[model samples]
Target: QAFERAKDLQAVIFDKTGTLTEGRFGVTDIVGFNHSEDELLQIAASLEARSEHPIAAAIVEEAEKRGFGLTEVEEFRAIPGKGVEGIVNGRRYMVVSPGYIRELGIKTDESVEKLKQQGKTVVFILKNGEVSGVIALADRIRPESREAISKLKAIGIKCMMLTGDNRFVAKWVAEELGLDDYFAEVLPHEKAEKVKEVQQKYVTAMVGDGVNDAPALAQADVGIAIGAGTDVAVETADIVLVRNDPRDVAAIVELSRKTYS
Candidate 1:
């Protein structure tokens, strides 16, 4: 069943970062391959302390959260998309993502796979050419996502997501939100095209807050922007969210007259 209400005919596509998720990262799982998990965080966090990325903040936050003392790092370097590298305790360590054994030669078991499958961003602690630990970071889902999805579904609207994140991360997020469908690893400019694909079957709405989301939001049947806490001014968006609650999506859709009770 479908509703041509809320200025819609079929579906909605939501951007992942800062739309469905808080855009803030937190350390979710830490597994040490050959050392203590704390040791993994200790060193990884120590090395990452100098990094300005939010991922670094999460790691360093983990260290401080557990009362781990922050120490100085040497030869610290950002390794493009791979992760970070530095010297801690006179040991050369590279904190890298699974994309890079966590790119090769690493033993991955249930703990590692479990985290990754759960949509956690997995990074490894490499100590002197050997694996030392595994750390997983994840964004917090919007508080209203589940309720929002349910409300939309009850009103006959299909829910979907677009993420620039990894496949596994996108998968689990969609699964958690009970989405009708999702597009994973879609980059900023790539989103508008994905919306066009979705539109071929059903009229759609796109919601987002980043520059990445601007075009897709505009391309949809309705463009909703979560602009309160973000810098991206969506001048072309049909609606700019004030409270940033995803449930507002439901509210807008239900703003349509009931096609059926």
Candidate 2:
């Protein structure tokens, strides 16, 4: 019943990558591609199925990972900030860091010039259809992001986005979605600081999915988490949206006012 807090809450802070976006991750970049898009996505799913990270979840969701018949990959390794690498079909296949081709010293024959320019990631393909370099993608917004923000504004609730993404990407998303405010490239540990900043003006509710957000979740006037995300998130929030929809944010707020008033 306390979920009614959204009525008086000054703002609802959101994580841009998964919370506002579809949470479906994918390749943001590609290099040395000599195969079809379907084949490239298949390999991305294969390498990602082994991890439980947000990026991996996005890939699995967007790329259709449920029934794909995948070959055994040898020496699978995930390097933080660099991406993953391994062997498949007796050839070395690497799905990795955004600039992995630069790291691999094979930039002369690259083909990912277009995707990166548009802000999407490119996944590279190597021998035997192996994944080489991947520009991993975040959960991008639905076309409805602007409309959603407009709806929130009409109801007099401020909107903001929180994320670990770079400023360019974060600002791009915020502008696209018409957010009233936003914080970009925040460390998981520093979310509380931003929460404090927002609270300086009004009652704020922060929503997130990682352990890093627990403190911000607890500190906010209302802490809302995605029910399907992390266990810590479920335990930390005041409201857990069982249905993962940004529009639900408006629904719950309106429901609270009618019930409480």
Candidate 3:
């Protein structure tokens, strides 16, 4: 059985969007909208001062509203495509991707709705070794995640989640479905590299929904695509999850065994 074989496998890498969180996201609220668009952007930029998720770009829209200068950002680095980082207050500051806060030591459940209002995935905020605040961001869960993670974990196949989502968001989703490990705020091309990290220890499978996840998908032992994702994503993967469910990963694992093992 697929479950039995999974018990001995090394690891499973998952793309966050469409594979875990719904690939689609939108702006829900503009907290500092009352101020001049430029001032608002300063605030949003301060909030998104170091982020790489789609919400960050949306937040940047607030910055463009007032034509606030968006600097080149000294540490302006992205976690591949998942999240971004920069310097603030003479010290490094990071406003992660969706679940990025979790890895940075922020907690999500602290302020779910408030974060969503800003059209940001509710994620923990960290600044210079302290919890600064929480941002609300929302994304839909892939319908099949529950069963897919459960089945995969049941067989000892360590399941790992990856995305621009913060840690709290990442863990929240994974815990709900029974995943083993995860990395947040990962960049697009780097997604594939993460797959390689896990592959070094064991055969890995990657499932993605965004263009960023393409490289990661290709890096896996079996690259899986989400049915509703971009055309580029569909073309980049080896196995397509036609139904866009996390559980489909389990199906791929099963099919691989029957076909090759």
Per model, state how many residue pairs clash.
3, 15, 31
Please say which candidate is ahead in lDDT: 1 or 3. Answer: 1
Q: Judging by TM-score, tell me the better candidate of 1 and 3.
A: 1
- Per-candidate TM-score against the hidden true structure: 0.70, 0.61, 0.51
Model 2 lDDT-worst window of ten: 127-136
Q: Per-residue CA lDDT of candidate 1, range 2-24, in tens?
A: 23444454798888887788889
* Model 2 Cα lDDT, one tens digit per residue, 70-123: 556789888876667677656766666546656766553434554454455455
List the candidates ranked by TM-score, beginning with the highest.
1, 2, 3
Candidate 3, poorest ten consecutive residues by summed lDDT: 31-40
Give me the overall lDDT of model 1.
0.80
lDDT of 2 at 260: 65
In model 1, the worst 10-residue window by lDDT is 1-10
